[PDB]
Amino acid sequence: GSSGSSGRTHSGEKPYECYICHARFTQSGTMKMHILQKHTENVAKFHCPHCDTVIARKSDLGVHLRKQHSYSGPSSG
Ligand SMILES: [Zn+2]
Ligand SMILES: [Zn+2]
């Protein structure tokens, strides 16, 4: 008993993939944003689509995106 053979070819490289819909992604950011865009309710814990940080709930995310990051309308005031 001793065998071994490989054979897997598929156009398109993506070191990332959604564990919800199996949607491959070539960008770590795109994926994270996809899971929170398509699976915003189908997820308990929330992760920042930018840095590695835990977020209570979606609504909370915004706060972090505004505090830690800069996500707001360009208004003078
Ligand atoms: Zn997905
Ligand atoms: Zn962040």
Curated annotation (Swiss-Prot):
Q: What does this protein do?
A: Chromatin binding factor that binds to DNA sequence specific sites and regulates the 3D structure of chromatin. Binds together strands of DNA, thus forming chromatin loops, and anchors DNA to cellular structures, such as the nuclear lamina. Defines the boundaries between active and heterochromatic DNA via binding to chromatin insulators, thereby preventing interaction between promoter and nearby enhancers and silencers. Plays a critical role in the epigenetic regulation. Participates in the allele-specific gene expression at the imprinted IGF2/H19 gene locus.
Tissue spec: Ubiquitous. Absent in primary spermatocytes.
Residues modified as Phosphoserine are S11
Q: What is this protein called?
A: Transcriptional repressor CTCF
Its gene name is: CTCF
Q: What else is known?
A: More than 13'00 CTCF-binding sites in potential insulators were identified in the human genome.
Localization annotation: Nucleus, Nucleoplasm; Chromosome; Chromosome, Centromere
Origin superkingdom: Eukaryota
Q: Which family does it belong to?
A: Belongs to the CTCF zinc-finger protein family.
Involvement in disease: Intellectual developmental disorder, autosomal dominant 21: A disorder characterized by significantly below average general intellectual functioning associated with impairments in adaptive behavior and manifested during the developmental period. Additional MRD21 features include short stature, microcephaly, and developmental delay.
**Which residues of the whole protein are included?**
399 to 462 of 727
| Oligomeric form and interacting partners | Interacts with CHD8. Interacts with LLPH. Interacts with CENPE. Interacts with BRD2; promoting BRD2 recruitment to chromatin.
Which parts of the sequence are C2H2-type zinc fingers? 16-39, 46-69
